[PDB]
Amino acid sequence: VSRLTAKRLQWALVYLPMLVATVYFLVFSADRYVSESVITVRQTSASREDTCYLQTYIHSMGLLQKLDQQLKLREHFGTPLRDPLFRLWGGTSQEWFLEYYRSRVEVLMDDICGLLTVRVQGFEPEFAQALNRAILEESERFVNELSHRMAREQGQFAEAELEDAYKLALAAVESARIEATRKLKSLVVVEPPVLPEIAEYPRRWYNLATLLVVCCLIYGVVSLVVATIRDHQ
Amino acid sequence: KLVSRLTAKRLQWALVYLPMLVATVYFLVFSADRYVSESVITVRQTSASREDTCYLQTYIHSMGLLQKLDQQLKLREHFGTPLRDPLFRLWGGTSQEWFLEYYRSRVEVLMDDICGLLTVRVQGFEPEFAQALNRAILEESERFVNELSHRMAREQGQFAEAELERAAYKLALAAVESARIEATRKLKSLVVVEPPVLPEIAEYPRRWYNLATLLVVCCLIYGVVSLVVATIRDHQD
Amino acid sequence: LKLREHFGTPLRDPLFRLWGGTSQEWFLEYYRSRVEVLMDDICGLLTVR
Amino acid sequence: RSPWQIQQAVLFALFLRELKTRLGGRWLGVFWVLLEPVAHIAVMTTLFSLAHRAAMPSIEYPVFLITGLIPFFMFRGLVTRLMEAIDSNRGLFAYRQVKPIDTVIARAMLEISLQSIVYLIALGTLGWLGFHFLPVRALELAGVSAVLIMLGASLGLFFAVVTNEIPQARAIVRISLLPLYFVSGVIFPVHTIPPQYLPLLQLNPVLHLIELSRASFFPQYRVLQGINLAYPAGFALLSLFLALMLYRLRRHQLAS
Numbered sequence: 001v002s003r004l005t006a007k008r009l010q011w012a013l014v015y016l017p018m019l020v021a022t023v024y025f026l027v028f029s030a031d032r033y034v035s036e037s038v039i040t041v042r043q044t045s046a047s048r049e050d051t052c053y054l055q056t057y058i059h060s061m062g063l064l065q066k067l068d069q070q071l072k073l074r075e076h077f078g079t080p081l082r083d084p085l086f087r088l089w090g091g092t093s094q095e096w097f098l099e100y101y102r103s104r105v106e107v108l109m110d111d112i113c114g115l116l117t118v119r120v121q122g123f124e125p126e127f128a129q130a131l132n133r134a135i136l137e138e139s140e141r142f143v144n145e146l147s148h149r150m151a152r153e154q155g156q157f158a159e160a161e162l163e164d165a166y167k168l169a170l171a172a173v174e175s176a177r178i179e180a181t182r183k184l185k186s187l188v189v190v191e192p193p194v195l196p197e198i199a200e201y202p203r204r205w206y207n208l209a210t211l212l213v214v215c216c217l218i219y220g221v222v223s224l225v226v227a228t229i230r231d232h233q
Numbered sequence: 234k235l236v237s238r239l240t241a242k243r244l245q246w247a248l249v250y251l252p253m254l255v256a257t258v259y260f261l262v263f264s265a266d267r268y269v270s271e272s273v274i275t276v277r278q279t280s281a282s283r284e285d286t287c288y289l290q291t292y293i294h295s296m297g298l299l300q301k302l303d304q305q306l307k308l309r310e311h312f313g314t315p316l317r318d319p320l321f322r323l324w325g326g327t328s329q330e331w332f333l334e335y336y337r338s339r340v341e342v343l344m345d346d347i348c349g350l351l352t353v354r355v356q357g358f359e360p361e362f363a364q365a366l367n368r369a370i371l372e373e374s375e376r377f378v379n380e381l382s383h384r385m386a387r388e389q390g391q392f393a394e395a396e397l398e399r400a401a402y403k404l405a406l407a408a409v410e411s412a413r414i415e416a417t418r419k420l421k422s423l424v425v426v427e428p429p430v431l432p433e434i435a436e437y438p439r440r441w442y443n444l445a446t447l448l449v450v451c452c453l454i455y456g457v458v459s460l461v462v463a464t465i466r467d468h469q470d
Numbered sequence: 471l472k473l474r475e476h477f478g479t480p481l482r483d484p485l486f487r488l489w490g491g492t493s494q495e496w497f498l499e500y501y502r503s504r505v506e507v508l509m510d511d512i513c514g515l516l517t518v519r
Numbered sequence: 520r521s522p523w524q525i526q527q528a529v530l531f532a533l534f535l536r537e538l539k540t541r542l543g544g545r546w547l548g549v550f551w552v553l554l555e556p557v558a559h560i561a562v563m564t565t566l567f568s569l570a571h572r573a574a575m576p577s578i579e580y581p582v583f584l585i586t587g588l589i590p591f592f593m594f595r596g597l598v599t600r601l602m603e604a605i606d607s608n609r610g611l612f613a614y615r616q617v618k619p620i621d622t623v624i625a626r627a628m629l630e631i632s633l634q635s636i637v638y639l640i641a642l643g644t645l646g647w648l649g650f651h652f653l654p655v656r657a658l659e660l661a662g663v664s665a666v667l668i669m670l671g672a673s674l675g676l677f678f679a680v681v682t683n684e685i686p687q688a689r690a691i692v693r694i695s696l697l698p699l700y701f702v703s704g705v706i707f708p709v710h711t712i713p714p715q716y717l718p719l720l721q722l723n724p725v726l727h728l729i730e731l732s733r734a735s736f737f738p739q740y741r742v743l744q745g746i747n748l749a750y751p752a753g754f755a756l757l758s759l760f761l762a763l764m765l766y767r768l769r770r771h772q773l774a775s
């Protein structure tokens with residue numbers, strides 16, 4: 001109707017949201033350095049099920065507990081006090097911490113060759129590199145321990161069973177212990193974690209231009225709609 | 234207050250001609266030639282192997298290979314040589330991520346899965362530098378596909394040494410000999426079908442092609458802004 | 471673990487509590503409702519919530 | 520009177536008029552509208568139940584086809600019925616209140632109401648037969664559906680405005696609509712599609728909307744790489760802007 005004048009429409013549709021967005025993106029947003037590593041799991045002398053474990057162990061909660069107890073991620077992500085959106089507020093719930101960690105660490109699996117890439121965000125490039133290295137090391141240790149547990153459970157039966165019977169018992173014990181001690185599988189590192197120089201997040205001008213286009217289009221649509229409505233007299 | 238100014242001729246000269254004259258005078262004069270050296274390789278196991286080729290396809294664009302190459306060949310100084318073509322030169326003092334983006338755009342890797350081959354095309358402002366860069370890429374790629382299995386061989390040899398330390402004895406010695414054989418053997422060889430060539434005439438500054446796309450994009454922009462101006466004029470009746 | 475004893479504790483909620491002396495089949499249906507098992511096709515991992 | 524109240528008057532008038540003409544008077548068209556989805560299910564499920572069970576064993580076929588079909592039927596109707604809106608009401612285009620925008624809005628409202636009713640009926644039937652019929656995430660599904668509404672209505676208005684003359688061109692609309700049933704992920708999951716056809720397949724906004732709706736419907740549904748809401752949302756916004764501008768240019772030329 002007559003209340004929605006053009007000046008009010010453009011002030012409330014393209015001017016004010018862009019002003020708020022540019023203020024936030026230039027004076028409040030915090031840089032987020034990203035470190036990327038590319039890995040695969042190989043069996044030392046099919047393998048899709050081996051690397052499919054890592055796609056859900058990286059986002060698992062136990063790995064998050066290990067990481068925090070190691071590198072203290074909880075107070076690192078709360079350091080930037082200027083940005084209220086991408087910081088981790090103190091005293092938040094454990095589930096929110098897990099969701100935030102899952103948002104920070106991004107895992108892509110390319111299935112044409114089973115290549116797994118991990119991109120880790122942080123507020124200091126050295127911290128991001130250290131977090132990526134810790135994730136790789138813990139994943140390798142876990143994929144080792146997965147077979148280690150089965151081999152030692154086999155060995156427990158062999159030691160519980162214990163002169164042909166004695167000979168086969170000691171042979172089985174030797175096989176079980178060489179299974180429980182060996183290095184069953186190793187994680188091949190196609191691209192080791194890198195130390196970034198600048199932060200690629202957030203790319204401020206991209207969202208500024210995109211959102212400017214969005215508000216321009218939205219204001220145009222609303223103005224044309226109200227013009228067509230006011231056509232009837 | 235404005236629609237009396239932007240008529241057809243003003244808008245046409247603003248968005249169809251002046252940017253186009255700027256683009257032509259940049260491409261035909263200011264742009265710098267970029268020579269292209271092309272090689273065709275694949276990986277076959279000595280004595281399928283698509284996974285090795287995909288590891289290589291990832292490794293060509295990897296950051297570590299870029300660090301090794303620039304150190305060996307001083308890529309940053311070479312790519313900053315032509316001051317005539319900035320829109321395609323590597324400005325000094327830029328970040329490592331922009332350096333990675335520039336290197337990724339300057340090297341093209343093509344998979345061919347029907348027949349199983351990798352094509353590497355490298356652009357450089359001099360042909361000899363492009364050929365040398367292609368050769369360095371090939372040799373570092375072969376070294377990488379060697380070390381990838383050398384690491385696992387050494388990793389098994391560590392347990393072989395642990396087993397000899399535990400102790401039967403001749404079995405442990407044979408296992409350690411096999412482990413050091415694996416750690417020393419040339420397991421995988423990169424065979425080359427087309428070795429890198431030395432180009433003569435630059436190919437990638439296909440100026441007419443970019444001008445052809447610029448024609449249609451400027452026409453689209455002109456049409457859209459003309460429709461917007463007509464809408465505003467209709468609103469001002 | 472006395473599941474039936476535990477699930478009858480919240481008296482404030484009238485729909486998500488387990489009433490007393492209900493049918494055994496209804497108990498089985500309620501237990502199936504509480505325990506969610508999802509099987510993923512690509513890798514075969516089974517998640518239980 | 521205010522323009523708003525006369526707007527409700529005229530849209531209610533054309534809405535009841537359009538209900539009259541589309542339903543046939545004796546309310547016979549509801550049987551047709553109800554019978555097309557179930558006939559599609561009966562044809563569709565008899566050849567690819569085993570193939571789908573081999574592909575995605577965790578998802579039932581009929582509910583998958585409901586979520587893939589009914590939004591697509593709604594989009595197809597929103598395009599087709601709104602494209603031919605001007606010619607149907609041509610004889611009554613001079614009452615100073617019957618501008619074409621009211622006609623296309625009335626047709627859009629009618630189609631949205633009818634297909635929403637069909638959606639509710641199909642979901643109730645699916646629940647009645649012992650299938651899974653509650654979306655785990657409801658309002659994201661509603662938002663994706665709203666994006667689909669905006670895109671479909673915008674495309675319909677754009678085609679109605681552009682092709683007021685040369686009605687022969689309307690053919691290359693509906694003839695082009697038939698491949699969109701196959702190429703988009705409606706009847707068979709795009710998981711089985713080879714990746715070498717994947718890039719061009721990503722150019723379809725309807726495929727993105729259908730996949731996102733299915734992901735928001737079922738629990739633990741995987742999305743392909745490159746599927747996003749930003750591309751179809753921008754497509755819908757740009758098409759709506761273009762259609763509104765083109766209607767504003769040729770507003771006075773749609774009267775005879």
Ligand SMILES: CCCCCCCCCCCC(=O)O[C@@H](COC(=O)CCCCCCCCCC)COP(=O)(O)OC[C@H](O)CO[C@@]1(C(=O)O)C[C@H](O)[C@@H](O)[C@H]([C@@H](O)CO)O1
Nearest residue numbers: 686687688689690691693694695696697698699700701702
């Ligand atoms: C944006 C353009 C894209 C072009 C796509 C072309 C593909 C084939 C289309 C079928 C072409 C077609 O028509 O459908 C066929 C059967 O389709 C199929 O089974 C498709 C099988 C596989 C396709 C799906 C797999 C997709 C795989 C990846 C893409 C019978 O349909 P139908 O009974 O409705 O035929 C009615 C006529 O179309 C009427 O049209 C006329 C005419 O012929 O009299 C009318 C009039 O004369 C004029 O308006 C008009 C003319 O003059 C104006 O150009 O032609």
